[PDB]
């Protein structure tokens, strides 16, 4: 009573404000975990798999349509009486339809949920990312019909975001879903700290008579491609010792520490994500 | 005993960590390669295979960051390459090392028992 559906307990815990002390732990309570697993294995596994298949088809069609884009200049491009041109245009139409679908789904989520502008950009990262991909697609359409070739820039950012968003569907499989929660926690905590310090050091040591060229040359060192003679020796050696040999290995060590302490927290967050998916599937 | 346990650990790492890592890494690589090759107008790297190989070179410490110039919007190309590098090389490959360390920490007894069962067989 008032657990399955009512303010129901599951809808209270799942849609919490992200300040609740134990939002991730309240789902480990005896009857709730077994109820969510029952709902999953009964109907939400199949629905979620169908959604994943539909998204994979959408991304495949979008990739195919963008791959075979014409190179003539100043769109729109007139369609030729060729089967290939009829496949390309239908793929483009499907891509634009999916973008509109995701834009409207993001608007509906921001309306019915009313995030408080902090949990907006501190929780619900999936919704924002899909919405941002849809925004890129719509901006691409607008630029395309304005006779601007910058439509391709917006389209390729929509494609890389859409392919990186496939990591959303790792939830629904425990091992991959927890690995993806651990990727989120690495990005928010270790990559952020390392990137701040690393960027400060890089900009200082970079400050080839242009700032951009020298910054790129010094960044090549981070990826194992540094020249040491690209165009001084003490500065380059100091930069190498402080970034490559110290800061990048320290990042590995801190990543090892994080993984050791987030094991239980990563599983709870994945379970909460799947509970949110199960509630969304039930409501819609 | 020592080489036996080492091989068992290799088996466990191939089945768990390499698998999870390869799935996420291949998804990222294909997405970023489809974006880069779409941005490219023409030339030597206007094929999916060529761009995929160029972006995979980054994983092995041989990435160019300037392997082509047949495009418009150089900013778009640089941003895509930097995003791919930050997401794979600096994050995912180090996370793999960190997850491999955890696995080593947690599979000593399991790896010795499996080796003993192998020798019994
Ligand atoms: C930063 C990434 C953080 C998000 C993430 O890693 O994974 C989120 C899922 O994301 C996805 O869709 C799948 C794709 C993720 C790809 C990797 C991260 C994005 C990078 Br490719 C970005 Br940088 C590209 C930006 C490109 C933008 C370009 C902008 C230009 C204008 C998890 O978040 P959640 O689903 O909402 O669940 C929350 C949970 O409910 C809550 O209980 C908990 O509290 C929270 O923690 C969540 O778990
Ligand atoms: C229409 C079917 C709609 C549908 O049933 O969903 C199928 C897919 C996936 O939708 P999702 O909610 O699981 O995405 C996750 C979004 N997040 C994280 C914000 C919740 O949506 C779609 O690509 C549908 C749009 C694709 C149309 C092209 C068909 C190929
Ligand atoms: C996930 C992978 C896909 C994500 C793509 C996100 C990149 C979107 C931002 C693009 C910014 C841009 O192109 O403008 C260039 C704009 C101008 O380029 P510049 O004059 O060379 O510096 O630079 C930026 O805005 C950098 C932001 C990245
Ligand atoms: Na190298």
Residue numbers in the entry:
A (entry chain A): 385 to 390, 393 to 593, 627 to 650, 659 to 711
B (entry chain D): 560 to 603, 627 to 703
Q: What did the published study say regarding this structure?
A:
To resolve this question, we exploited our ability to generate TRPV1 protein with an empty vanilloid pocket, into which we introduced tetrabrominated analogs of PI or PIP2 (PI–Br4 and PIP2–Br4, respectively) as contrast-enhancing probes to distinguish these lipids from the other, unbrominated lipids in the nanodiscs. Previous work has established that brominated lipids are faithful analogs of the unsaturated lipids from which they are synthesized. In these high-resolution structures (2.2–2.4 Å resolution), we were able to identify the bromine atoms within the oleoyl tails of the lipids by visually comparing the resulting reconstructions against those previously determined for samples containing endogenous lipids. The well-resolved inositol headgroup of the bound lipids showed the expected differential location of phosphate moieties, most notably at the 4 and 5 positions for PIP2. Furthermore, conformations of both PI- and PIP2-reconstituted channels resemble the apo channel containing a native resident lipid. Together, these data demonstrate that the vanilloid site can accommodate PI or PIP2, where they act as negative regulatory factors to stabilize the closed state.
The capsaicin- and heat-activated receptor, TRPV1, has served as a model for deciphering lipid modulation, which is relevant to understanding how pro-algesic agents enhance channel activity in the setting of inflammatory pain. Identification of a pocket within the TRPV1 transmembrane core has provided initial clues as to how phosphoinositide lipids bind to and regulate the channel. Here we show that this regulatory pocket in rat TRPV1 can accommodate diverse lipid species, including the inflammatory lipid lysophosphatidic acid, whose actions are determined by their specific modes of binding. We captured several states of TRPV1 ranging from channels in which the VBP is empty to those bearing different bioactive lipids, including distinct phosphoinositide species, brominated phosphoinositide analogs and a pro-algesic lipid, lysophosphatidic acid (LPA). Together, our data show how the VBP accommodates a range of bioactive lipids and how occupancy of the site corresponds to the structural status of the pore.
